[PDB]
Design a protein around this nucleic acid. Structure first.
Ligand SMILES: [Cl-]
Ligand SMILES: [Cl-]
Ligand SMILES: [Mg+2]
Ligand SMILES: [Mg+2]
Ligand SMILES: [Mg+2]
Ligand SMILES: [Mg+2]
Ligand SMILES: [Mg+2]
Ligand SMILES: [Mg+2]
Ligand SMILES: [Mg+2]
Ligand SMILES: [Mg+2]
Ligand SMILES: [Mg+2]
Ligand code: NA
Ligand code: NA
Ligand code: NA
Ligand code: NA
Ligand code: NA
Ligand code: NA
Lengths: 186, 160, 154, 140, 95
RNA sequence: UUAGGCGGCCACAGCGGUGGGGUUGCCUCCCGUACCCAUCCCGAACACGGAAGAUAAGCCCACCAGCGUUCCAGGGAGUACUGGAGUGCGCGAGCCUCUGGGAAAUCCGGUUCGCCGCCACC
RNA sequence: GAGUGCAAGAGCAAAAGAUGACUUGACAGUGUUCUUCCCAACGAGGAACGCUGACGCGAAAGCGUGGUCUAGCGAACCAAU
RNA sequence: CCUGUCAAACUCCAAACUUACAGACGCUGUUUGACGCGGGGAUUCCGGUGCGCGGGGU
């Protein structure tokens, strides 16, 4: 910008979407990164590997293609998160992938956060990932219990669109159940 | 002391004052001369004094010559005639002297000189077509007080 | 294809230069070798430029010399059409000479000593203190300029 | 267009730059929430040598907590012109400052893919006077 | 020299041109070389760890196994063979 | 790639500016604090929950060279400097010829307002 | 352009700086390599990089073999421990 | 804005050139055994000059 001496940050640093100091510590394990990413209405889970001209995504999972299996609820919450992870973790398994390290990107390691949820799900998909069982949300909050109890304080439906009134964390079970299943077209 | 002791440009460039101290003041009174408010573009004739050999000129000579030159212009063109001469080189090179024999012989700072590569313009005066033979004379006296031989070369001016 | 002729001695000659000259099969003043024109070969003659005389000789001239100064890889045997014939891939001196200039083979590939040990220039040379452009004898030459030397040292 | 461009108060800070306390009290009651110790940097001949040490306090108000402060705050002041920031902000007064900006400031305050607000979307002194003035009082 | 430390006279070689200033990319710091591969030695001014003695900048050794994460690269100093412990961050593949 | 995620090279990508773009799609801003989590004070941020509204930001798309940068043409310049050679010149400082290399500033005109890999996606 | 204990040169910006909290890896053992001493033999000393053991922190990859890098050091004999 | 100069301990630039490794040609080695390894014996550690580049010094 200013002159010839001026130092322009690396592009993805300008954009502020990649933390390189953390990316380096990540790459060190040598294992594939389990990219945990969120969106206002969605949550993505990628299993990335290093490559000659950039990274290679061997398996992914987006909260949107979650309904492709029966989901009929929102796609930016905990049950959604865990599930997206399990899905990606499954496809991951299918790809030959076995172990991975959690890349939560620019997100915060807040206990019980959706990422750890994404992580919990992938781990359950049979993937080995250095984790910490008690930094994860308790099984119930993953189900989506905190949400159903919030609509309990109904008066006005927590959900605009039509999908129950008090909500269904069972749907969560039904879906996990569906994936754990051997058949299911991945 | 003799210019023989400092006229050659064989030593390294010694100017970094952040390391040199006790450097004597430049005897050069002033570089800008004549009517320093008017411009060199305002003059038809432009004559420069060119040093024909690459050398070093101690500030004592720059002043000595620059003096006897402008001093003349003043005499022939009044103290405010319509001319303006300029000394474009400055004494940046610091000079030392080892004034104990050759033991700890690095010298002590004694002066400053200006390195002029042969072919450069030590002086450049600007005047009107009539004073030209005066500005030339101011230079014939100036080149008599510096180590090298010079050329009095007319720049803009074929009104001869 | 150029003809190299060392015209200056080894004393005081830079070593990396002398070694190059030796790599070009020349070990004595007045010795001549036939070098091809390659990036690599030009790189070397450039480095030797100041202690040698070189250029491309005429078929005719090359023949006079090959005849007069060529030798086997060992022995006195005079190289002549018959020799050339009974030993080389050619029918006569000319047949060889043509191959050298056309850079199809080398004095070596034909059991010939890489060097043509010439005789001092008859009538003397143009001096070893100046190049050709200054009237000296060092450096690159005309196909005619080289011939005068080669033939003077015939 | 208008909707996602009309001003809004993001924060109203109220602090007291003392110089060496019992002030946190009033700021608490006056605003409606807890204050914040204010430390300083660099040693000062005015017996203010201690670097890290309480020297004041402040309170950052947001939403209702902030308006419900201005509704009584603003009155006690005779807003002027030279009193406005270039970003369309302004301070007056015990100090009280008002931070103003349009509906998309989060873009420059978040963590992920943050970005500074384009000038053509920044607020202006004029545009500031408007919104505020248009709320129970007068300008200059 | 006035002193004889490892960084003596390394003002030039162990410094970055202004635009190369700042944290270097992670890709080349994780590079995986194979034994036998010819590599170029050049300390990265921005990378603190994994360096080798400056004298060897410019060398082109041969990866011959590694130690921990760093690599063990064989080179020849003048006429003496030496083994240099260096991380990828300061290495480039020849060709 | 009708707006996505991870990157490689790390300004050719920076700085500045203009135009265009989104009813159950995307990214957002946005709405909102029961919960996980959160502020040395603020649900601002962080975290969680969600769609009433919006395309004004950001972002994606098209484009502008004024500044910065990359490369190229011509001019500067085969100049400056320089590896090799000289019973060439010069009181000397230094210069010169032959041989092999060869800038920099500046000016003028082009270029450049990123390119590329992987994955996902009416 | 700040700062990073001290020369000078160098390194660093979601940090190597600042603030906060927690912590004692300034740990024990044993090596590889470079340096000391370019090339090219030579001790003490130094550094880089490993392993073993035990620990600190972190969600985790990971980081910690003192201070961002290059100065701050000492044989035998004897003593004490 | 305009205008006048500099840097051994300045650098947005920047050679020639020196240098690591590899290939190619050359040259060389495989009865003249190169490259290298092990061992025995030294001498030597007052140098000087020209040229180029230097630092000090009239
Ligand atoms: Cl994210
Ligand atoms: Cl080393
Ligand atoms: Mg014979
Ligand atoms: Mg005779
Ligand atoms: Mg003669
Ligand atoms: Mg240097
Ligand atoms: Mg728009
Ligand atoms: Mg350290
Ligand atoms: Mg004793
Ligand atoms: Mg004791
Ligand atoms: Mg050198
Ligand atoms: Na004495
Ligand atoms: Na004179
Ligand atoms: Na860097
Ligand atoms: Na406090
Ligand atoms: Na927009
Ligand atoms: Na040692």
């Amino acid at each position: 910008a200013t002159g010839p001496r001026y130092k322009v940050p690396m592009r993805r640093r300008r954009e502020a979407r990649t933390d390189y100091h953390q990316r380096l510590r990540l790459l060190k394990s040598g294992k594939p990164r389990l990219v945990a990413r969120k969106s206002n209405k969605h949550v993505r889970a990628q299993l990335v590997t290093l490559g000659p001209n950039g990274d290679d995504t061997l398996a992914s999972a987006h909260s949107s293609d979650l309904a492709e299996y029966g989901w009929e609820a929102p796609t930016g919450n905990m049950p959604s998160a865990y599930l997206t992870g399990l899905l990606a973790g499954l496809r991951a398994q299918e790809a030959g992938v076995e172990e991975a390290v959690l890349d939560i990107g620019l997100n915060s390691p807040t206990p019980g956060s959706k990422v750890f949820a994404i992580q919990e799900g992938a781990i359950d998909a049979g993937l080995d990932i250095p984790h910490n069982d008690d930094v994860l949300a308790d099984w119930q909050r993953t189900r989506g219990a905190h949400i159903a109890e919030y609509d309990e304080q109904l008066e006005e439906p927590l959900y605009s669109g039509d999908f129950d009134a008090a909500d269904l964390p069972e749907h969560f079970d039904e879906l996990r159940e569906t994936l754990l299943d051997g058949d299911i077209e991945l | 002391k003799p210019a023989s002791m400092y006229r050659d440009i064989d030593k390294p460039a010694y100017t970094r004052r952040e390391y040199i101290t006790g450097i004597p003041g430049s005897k050069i009174a002033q570089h800008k001369m004549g009517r320093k408010q008017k411009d060199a573009d305002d003059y038809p004739v432009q004559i420069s004094l060119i040093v024909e050999e690459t050398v070093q000129l101690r500030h004592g000579s720059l002043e000595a010559s620059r003096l006897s030159a402008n001093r003349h212009l003043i005499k022939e063109l009044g103290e405010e005639g319509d001319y303006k001469m300029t000394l474009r080189k400055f004494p940046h090179q610091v000079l030392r002297e080892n004034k104990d024999g050759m033991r700890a012989a690095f010298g002590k700072i004694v002066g400053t000189a200006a390195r002029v590569q042969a072919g450069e313009q030590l002086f450049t005066a600007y005047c009107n077509v009539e004073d030209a033979e005066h500005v030339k004379e101011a230079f014939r006296r100036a080149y008599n007080k510096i180590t090298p031989s010079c050329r009095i070369k007319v720049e803009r001016g074929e009104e001869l | 294809m150029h003809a190299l002729v060392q015209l200056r001695g080894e004393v005081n000659m830079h070593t990396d230069i002398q070694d190059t000259l030796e790599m070009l099969n020349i070990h004595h003043v007045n010795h001549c070798t036939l070098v091809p024109e390659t990036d690599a070969y030009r790189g070397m003659v450039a480095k030797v430029n100041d202690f040698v005389a070189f250029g491309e000789p005429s078929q005719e001239t090359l023949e006079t010399v090959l005849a007069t100064r060529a030798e086997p890889l060992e022995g006195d045997a005079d190289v002549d059409d018959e020799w050339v014939a009974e030993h080389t891939d050619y029918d006569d001196i000319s047949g060889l000479a043509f191959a050298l200039l056309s850079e199809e083979t080398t004095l070596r590939e034909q059991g010939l000593s890489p060097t043509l040990r010439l005789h001092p220039p008859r009538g003397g040379h143009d001096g070893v203190k100046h190049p050709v452009k200054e009237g000296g004898q060092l450096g690159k030459h005309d196909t005619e300029g080289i011939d005068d030397l080669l033939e003077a040292m015939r | 267009f208008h909707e996602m461009r009309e001003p809004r108060i993001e924060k109203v800070v109220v602090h007291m730059g003392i110089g060496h306390a019992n002030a946190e009290d009033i700021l608490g009651e006056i605003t409606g929430q807890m204050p914040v110790r204010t430390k300083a940097k660099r040693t000062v001949g005015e017996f203010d040598i201690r670097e890290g040490d309480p020297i004041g306090a402040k309170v950052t108000l947001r939403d209702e907590m902030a308006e419900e402060f201005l509704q009584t705050a603003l009155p006690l002041a005779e807003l002027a012109t030279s009193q406005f920031d270039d970003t369309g902000n302004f301070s007056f007064g015990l100090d009280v400052t008002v931070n103003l900006v349009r509906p998309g400031y989060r873009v420059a305050k978040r963590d992920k893919a943050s970005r500074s607000i384009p000038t053509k979307h920044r607020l202006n002194p004029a545009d500031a006077v408007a919104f505020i003035e248009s709320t129970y009082d007068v300008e200059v | 020299p006035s002193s004889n430390g490892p960084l003596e006279g390394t003002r030039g070689k162990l410094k970055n041109k202004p635009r190369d200033r700042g944290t270097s990319p992670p890709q080349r710091a994780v590079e995986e070389f194979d034994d036998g591969e010819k590599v170029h030695l050049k300390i990265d001014p921005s990378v603190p760890n994994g360096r080798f003695h400056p004298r060897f900048d410019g060398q082109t050794g041969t990866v011959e196994g590694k130690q921990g994460d760093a690599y063990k690269v064989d080179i020849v100093d003048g006429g003496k063979e030496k083994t240099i412990i260096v991380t990828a961050a300061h290495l480039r593949r020849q060709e």
